[PDB]
Amino acid sequence: STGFLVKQRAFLKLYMITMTEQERLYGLKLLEVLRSEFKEIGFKPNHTEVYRSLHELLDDGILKQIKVKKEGAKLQEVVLYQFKDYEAAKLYKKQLKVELDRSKKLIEKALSDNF
Amino acid sequence: STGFLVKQRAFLKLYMITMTEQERLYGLKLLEVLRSEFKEIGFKPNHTEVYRSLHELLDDGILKQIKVKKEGAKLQEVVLYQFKDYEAAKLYKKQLKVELDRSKKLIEKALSDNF
DNA sequence: ATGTTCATAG
DNA sequence: CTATGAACATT
DNA sequence: ATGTTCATAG
DNA sequence: CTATGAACATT
Numbered sequence: 001s002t003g004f005l006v007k008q009r010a011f012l013k014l015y016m017i018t019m020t021e022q023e024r025l026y027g028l029k030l031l032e033v034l035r036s037e038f039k040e041i042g043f044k045p046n047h048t049e050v051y052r053s054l055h056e057l058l059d060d061g062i063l064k065q066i067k068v069k070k071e072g073a074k075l076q077e078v079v080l081y082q083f084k085d086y087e088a089a090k091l092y093k094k095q096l097k098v099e100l101d102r103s104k105k106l107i108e109k110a111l112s113d114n115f
Numbered sequence: 116s117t118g119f120l121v122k123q124r125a126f127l128k129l130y131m132i133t134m135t136e137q138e139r140l141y142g143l144k145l146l147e148v149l150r151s152e153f154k155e156i157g158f159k160p161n162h163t164e165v166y167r168s169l170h171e172l173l174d175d176g177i178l179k180q181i182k183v184k185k186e187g188a189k190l191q192e193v194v195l196y197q198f199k200d201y202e203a204a205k206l207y208k209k210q211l212k213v214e215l216d217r218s219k220k221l222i223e224k225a226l227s228d229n230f
Numbered sequence: 231a232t233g234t235t236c237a238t239a240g
Numbered sequence: 241c242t243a244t245g246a247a248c249a250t251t
Numbered sequence: 252a253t254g255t256t257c258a259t260a261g
Numbered sequence: 262c263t264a265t266g267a268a269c270a271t272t
Binding site for chain 1: 253
Binding site: 002003004005006008011014015017018037038041042043044045046049093096097100101102103104105106107108109110111113114115 | 117118119120121123126129130132133152153156157158159160161164208211212215216217218219220221222223224225226228229230
């Protein structure tokens with residue numbers, strides 16, 4: 001790595017944590033939800049991308065799965081996520097501020113140097 | 116595309132324009148120069164990357180080359196760049212502010228939503 | 231899309 | 241030993 | 252690294 | 262028709 005700007009991967013990973021920290025949801029939902037909180041700014045991620053973030057937070061030993069099967073019209077086997085390791089959860093939820101803080105400087109530096 | 120953050124490619128492209136707008140230099144120089152203006156922030160790009168940016172601004176019909184051969188110890192056939200199309204130069208030097216302005220919002224949005 | 235290694239040139 | 245590229249390889 | 256298409260499951 | 266994945270493909 002050269003340490004440019006934050007990867008989309010890590011960016012989403014962080015939204016999951018935050019959203020899990022409260023809403024406690026499943027993939028396809030998050031996607032739709034994020035697609036609304038960024039619609040205006042024109043950032044539209046995709047399920048596959050959203051999914052990969054979740055799966056990653058698995059091997060990182062954090063968010064663990066938790067499958068649910070209910071009865072009725074929306075008869076899905078929807079998959080929710082909760083915290084596995086909360087220690088790592090806030091360990092990561094900070095080494096990500098650092099990157100967002102570092103990545104801001106650039107967009108500023110650029111926006112200033114060039115303009 | 117999904118319109119996440121600005122690619123490194125376009126980021127550099129912009130520095131070239133700006134730097135050409137005044138300094139008028141050659142590849143390996145820019146690299147070393149950029150490596151100093153970002154050292155502190157910890158962003159260290161590479162020649163290959165810097166090079167690709169230049170070459171790209173070629174087919175975009177803008178920066179045109181201009182090879183020079185002098186005599187003495189540093190006997191290089193160093194390759195400088197100047198403006199081909201200045202109309203496109205400021206056309207692009209704005210659709211890049213738009214991306215830097217758009218890409219800032221995110222790092223803010225993130226840094227705010229999550230924190 | 232971008233980083234790491236190899237080619238040629240002086 | 242510097243400069244400019246391209247091929248190769250990875251993410 | 253990330254986007255676009257295909258597989259399976261209800 | 263939605264949900265979750267993985268394979269495939271591109272940048």
